Design a protein around this nucleic acid. Structure first.
Ligand code: A1IC4
Ligand code: K
Ligand code: K
Ligand code: K
Ligand code: K
Ligand code: K
Ligand code: K
Ligand code: K
Ligand code: K
Ligand code: K
Ligand code: K
Ligand code: K
Ligand code: MG
Ligand code: MG
Ligand code: MG
Ligand code: MG
Ligand code: MG
Ligand code: MG
Ligand code: MG
Ligand code: MG
Ligand code: MG
Ligand code: MG
Ligand code: MG
Ligand code: MG
Ligand code: MG
Ligand code: MG
Ligand code: MG
Ligand code: MG
Ligand code: MG
Ligand code: MG
Ligand code: MG
Ligand code: MG
Ligand code: MG
Ligand code: MG
Ligand code: MG
Ligand code: MG
Ligand code: MG
Lengths: 78, 121, 155, 129, 70, 205
RNA sequence: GUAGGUGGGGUAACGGCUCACCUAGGCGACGAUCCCUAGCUGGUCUGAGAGGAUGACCAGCCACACUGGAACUGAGACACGGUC
RNA sequence: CACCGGCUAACUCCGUGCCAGCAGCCGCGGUAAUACGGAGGGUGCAAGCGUUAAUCGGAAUUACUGGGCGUAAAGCGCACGCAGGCGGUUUGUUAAGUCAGAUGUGAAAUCCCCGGGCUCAACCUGGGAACUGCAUCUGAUACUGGCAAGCUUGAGUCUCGUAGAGG
RNA sequence: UGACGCUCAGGUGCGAAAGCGUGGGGAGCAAACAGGAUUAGAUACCCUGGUAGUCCACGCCGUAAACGAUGUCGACUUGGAGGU
């Protein structure tokens, strides 16, 4: 149900992708809306995602040291 | 400064130092007099002003003003110093507390006695 | 009219003999009901300097639209290096102003105001900035007039 | 380059009023026309018109009252380098509600008063007084 | 009511900047003396070799005030 | 913790009758009210704006008999309370039991009233209160205790209060020796000589 | 073991937690790494506010128990007044 | 208990004579010192009063609110240019930013408001308000962003010609 | 043609004169220096000479009151007299 949408920035790991989730946040002091990036290691069972793809992801149990997110679907192919 | 420049590098507040570093944020410090002497003040004024070089417990060697008329301090006197610049003496950032430890009160004082460590007659 | 001495300054011009000293006098006057003016007098003696200032102040009185002993809205005044800010206050606040601004606001008949003086606080330039503030203030009725509306439509 | 057409429009009104111009003209846009409509109905300008087709041009007829310009001040608030948005409860009163703030809400560009009564916040385009 | 000084004669052995002087006293001790205010105000010049009265203090016997020049 | 020194010196410094004597005799007959106290008192120097503010504050303090810390607290309360701080401040001072006892006419001065209170001679709603700063509220009945009804100073103090302007916000009964604090005094009910806005400004520094 | 994978082992439990093998990744100017300082918070002080400073008392959380290791017992400890 | 030259409420006499000393800053003291020391008088606080330390304020003196850069401190010697910031105009679409409503949460204490209890107060306490936040759901779609298709006014290309101590 | 734009930390290049390296060149000029004066002194200004250098090639240096002591780009806002 609860998902993040972001862009694939690596696919060099077996069954794993790095996904960048871009956020647009008001700066606390100065009030300018800044772009902030959360990078997440995500599980990609079938190795379907390539770099540039837009992917929907969901939070799951730990799968490795760094992985606690899994691929839902590819929204847009690159 | 533009908003975007402040985002990249915020307003740095100036790190204002103490005027009384040898106290180390204590209201007084004890010390031992290493020398007790007189010094001539800066141009407009003239006097022989009573001072002492004091080795503090925390190991800072500082100069302290000995206020009031007349004092009993010698080398190896143990004194309490407070904060207090004397404008017309370079480097004198501390006053000796009168009527504390080895430093006597001022003789025959009747006004501002509490500033010079003198009991009520 | 109410009258108030703000500052008296001894000024000096060098001549071949030595120095000719003379006195300046910043004063303000007002009715305590919207009208206020400032004057600046020069003389060789202080009492003459004051009287000159008072006479100039009496003839250079502006009008101000006050809302029952306070301002209509926040106002910013500037003159030279003096930048002043004033805003309306509720009854019983009193005049929360500094030095020169208070004198102006007192005699003008502003009982309740919150004020601050930024930049230079030279009395001469502060008084001008203050009165510059009060003259550029707008009532509801005159805002309604220029905009071609009623007071109800504006407010 | 030109990066704020709205600031430009406001500057044209401000400069035009300072130079006692009868009217000011500029390249039109839907948003400019929207702001122009607020200015007109609040009575800070007399009228406006759009002329052209491929390259439309907005003309504004400036008001004067007893010689003096009606637009005392006109300030760009939200700008490209720093966008400003406000919730309905924190909509700014300009000149203790003698001026207007022009607010882009989800129900179109309007005054802060109308945004409050509608019960909407939005982007604070400009102050006018 | 003030504490008392020790007057003593001496010869100015050298002049120093800003009306400061080395003065060898009667007892043979060299003090760094300074000019009095009254002598400064009245423009009494002091030179190397001049015989001077020096007011000393018991608080410091390396310092003095030149109050008279003979 | 109280001022125990000479009274008329205070009146002289303010340049007004602070009512610190009973008022059987005129203040000019007991002292030189026009002249400030001391050697250099015949001089009348020009007083600064700060000095005007201070002397207004000290006037009100000296009337009621309140030291600075307690007065500053009364100011903080007035600032907090809704409405006019200046009017609130004077209401609080008028609330005080020592004042109320005086205004009813049981003490000849506020100092004599303060002693009555302090010496457990006053009851608020039938209960002994010996705190001078006790805030009396509307519809409270201040009274003299049966032991203190015989006190000759209380008989005399009533006769003095008959001379003075009677408070409209109180209602005393001389035979009973009790009175009802009907309401809080309005700003109109108190004297116009007090420029309370000067105190408001003084503390706004 | 660094990042991921596969398989075995391990844990109350997911997991490089561990191991073997395979792949060559992973993090970093949106400040990694390194150095210095520091228990965190509710709050507290100051300030018109926005801020700034602070984290004593009280209450929540964490860490430590002469110093460095280690486990045992137990529902729970790697245990202030337990063990080696 | 401190203070009484100004800031800063409060002034005289005597002693001293740039000495002794005072002092936060400006300053005071060299013979008639309201500034030193004492005294009389006064002012401010008061079971405290001063002094020191420390923080914020005043300081718009790091300026988001809320500052500057010709000469006061401050435009890189000049350009090109990657990252980054910013983006003319129209339609559709999306709904990230944004806005609205709702739900959950935001410990108690503390702060604030209206009450209550200790003779009053401090203090204790009932209820409320507040906790400006975070998440989710449902909506809104002007503006900003994404996506798609355009448009020609920004920016380029081509044609012809001109001046020039440009290299 | 159809927003392809503006700005730009880091980066890259250009950057007077002096200076540096290597090899040429060297009329005039001229730091240093030599002599002649002046003067209280004259390590100067003045006079007569004079080396580096000034010139060329290639490489280096990266600074100047490198100034409009005024960053770049865009829009808007009365006039007058000139130059090209
Ligand atoms: N030497 C010493 O220690 O002190 C003496 C000095 O003060 C002399 C004085 N000098 C000057 O002004 C210099 N001006 C610059 C050029 C050289 C020189 O001339 C002077 O008066 N000169 C005279 C000539 C002279 C030199 N020695 C004796 N007489 C002179 O004619 N000076 C001219 C002037 O003062 O306007 C001018 O400077 C000048 C022209 N031609 C020459 Cl040479 N000098
Ligand atoms: K002096
Ligand atoms: K109030
Ligand atoms: K590992
Ligand atoms: K594994
Ligand atoms: K905090
Ligand atoms: K340990
Ligand atoms: K057990
Ligand atoms: K700013
Ligand atoms: K949109
Ligand atoms: K770029
Ligand atoms: K040569
Ligand atoms: Mg983890
Ligand atoms: Mg007390
Ligand atoms: Mg620590
Ligand atoms: Mg502030
Ligand atoms: Mg177990
Ligand atoms: Mg433990
Ligand atoms: Mg145990
Ligand atoms: Mg133990
Ligand atoms: Mg004297
Ligand atoms: Mg600040
Ligand atoms: Mg500045
Ligand atoms: Mg300069
Ligand atoms: Mg400069
Ligand atoms: Mg430049
Ligand atoms: Mg756009
Ligand atoms: Mg949204
Ligand atoms: Mg709570
Ligand atoms: Mg769009
Ligand atoms: Mg550029
Ligand atoms: Mg060269
Ligand atoms: Mg060469
Ligand atoms: Mg030559
Ligand atoms: Mg030559
Ligand atoms: Mg440079
Ligand atoms: Mg420069």
């Amino acid at each position: 149900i609860r998902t993040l949408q972001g862009r694939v920035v690596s696919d060099k790991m077996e069954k794993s992708i790095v996904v960048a989730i871009e956020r647009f946040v008001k700066h606390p002091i100065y009030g300018k809306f800044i772009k902030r990036t959360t990078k997440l290691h995500v599980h990609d069972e079938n190795n379907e995602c390539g770099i540039g793809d837009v992917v929907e992801i969901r939070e799951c149990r730990p799968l490795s040291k760094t992985k606690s997110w899994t691929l839902v679907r590819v929204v847009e192919k690159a | 400064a533009t908003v975007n420049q402040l985002v990249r590098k915020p307003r740095a507040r100036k790190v204002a130092k103490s005027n009384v570093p040898a106290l180390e944020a204590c209201p007084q410090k004890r010390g031992v007099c290493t020398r007790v002497y007189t010094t001539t003040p800066k141009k407009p004024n003239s006097a022989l002003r009573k001072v002492c070089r004091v080795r503090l417990t925390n190991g800072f060697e500082v100069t302290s003003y000995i206020g009031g008329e007349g004092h009993n301090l010698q080398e190896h006197s143990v004194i309490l110093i407070r904060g207090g610049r004397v404008k017309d003496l370079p480097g004198v950032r501390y006053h000796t507390v009168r009527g504390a430890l080895d430093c006597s009160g001022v003789k025959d004082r009747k006004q501002a006695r509490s500033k010079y460590g003198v009991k009520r007659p | 009219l109410q009258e108030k001495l703000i500052a008296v300054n001894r000024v000096s011009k060098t001549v071949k003999g030595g120095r000719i000293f003379s006195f300046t006098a910043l004063t303000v006057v007002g009715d305590g009901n919207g009208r206020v003016g400032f004057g600046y007098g020069k003389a060789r003696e202080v009492p003459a300097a004051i009287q000159k200032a008072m006479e100039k102040a009496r003839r250079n009185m502006i009008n101000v639209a006050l809302n029952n002993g306070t301002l209509q809205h926040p106002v910013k005044g500037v003159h030279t290096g003096s930048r002043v800010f004033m805003q309306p206050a509720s009854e019983g606040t009193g005049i929360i102003a500094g030095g020169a601004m208070r004198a102006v606001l007192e005699v003008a008949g502003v009982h309740n105001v919150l004020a601050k003086a930024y930049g230079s606080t030279n009395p001469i330039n502060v008084v001008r900035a203050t009165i510059d503030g009060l003259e550029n203030m707008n009532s509801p009725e005159m805002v309604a007039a220029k905009r071609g509306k009623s007071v109800e439509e504006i407010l | 380059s030109m990066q704020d057409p709205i600031a430009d429009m406001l500057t044209r009104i401000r400069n035009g009023q300072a130079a006692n111009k009868a009217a000011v003209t500029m390249p039109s846009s839907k948003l400019k026309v929207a702001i122009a409509n607020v200015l007109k109905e609040e009575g800070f300008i007399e009228d406006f018109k759009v002329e052209g087709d491929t390259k439309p041009e907005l003309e504004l007829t400036l008001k004067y009252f007893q010689g003096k310009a009606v637009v005392e001040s006109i300030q760009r608030v939200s700008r490209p380098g720093l966008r400003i948005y406000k919730r309905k409860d924190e909509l700014p009163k300009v000149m203790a509600g003698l001026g207007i703030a022009v607010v882009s809400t989800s129900k179109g560009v309007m005054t802060d008063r109308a945004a409050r009564q509608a019960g909407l916040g939005g982007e604070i385009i400009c102050y006018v007084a | 009511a003030k504490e008392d000084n020790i007057e003593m004669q001496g010869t100015v052995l050298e002049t120093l900047p800003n009306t400061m002087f080395r003065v060898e006293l009667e007892n043979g001790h060299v003090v760094t003396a300074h000019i009095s205010g009254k002598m400064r105000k009245n423009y009494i010049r002091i030179l190397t070799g001049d015989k001077v009265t020096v007011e000393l203090t018991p608080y410091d016997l390396s310092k003095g005030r030149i109050v008279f020049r003979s | 913790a109280r001022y125990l020194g000479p009274k008329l010196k205070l009146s002289r410094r303010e340049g007004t009758d602070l009512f610190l004597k009973s008022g059987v005799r005129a203040i000019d007959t007991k002292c030189k009210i026009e002249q400030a106290p001391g050697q250099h008192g015949a001089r009348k120097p020009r007083l600064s704006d700060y000095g005007v503010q201070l002397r207004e504050k000290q006037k009100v303090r000296r009337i009621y008999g309140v030291l600075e810390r307690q007065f500053r607290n009364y100011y903080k309360e007035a600032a907090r309370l809704k409405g006019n701080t200046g009017e609130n401040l004077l209401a609080l001072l008028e609330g005080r039991l020592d004042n109320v006892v005086y205004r009813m006419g049981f003490g000849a001065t506020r100092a004599e009233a303060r002693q009555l209170v302090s010496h457990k001679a006053i009851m608020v709603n039938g209960r002994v209160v010996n705190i001078a700063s006790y805030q009396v509220s509307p519809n409270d009945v201040v009274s003299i205790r049966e032991k203190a009804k015989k006190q000759s100073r209380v008989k005399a103090a009533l006769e003095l209060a008959e001379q003075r302007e009677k408070p409209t916000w109180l209602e005393v009964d001389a035979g009973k020796m009790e009175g009802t604090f009907k309401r809080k005094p309005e700003r109109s009910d108190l004297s116009a000589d007090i420029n309370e806005h000067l105190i408001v400004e003084l503390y706004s520094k």
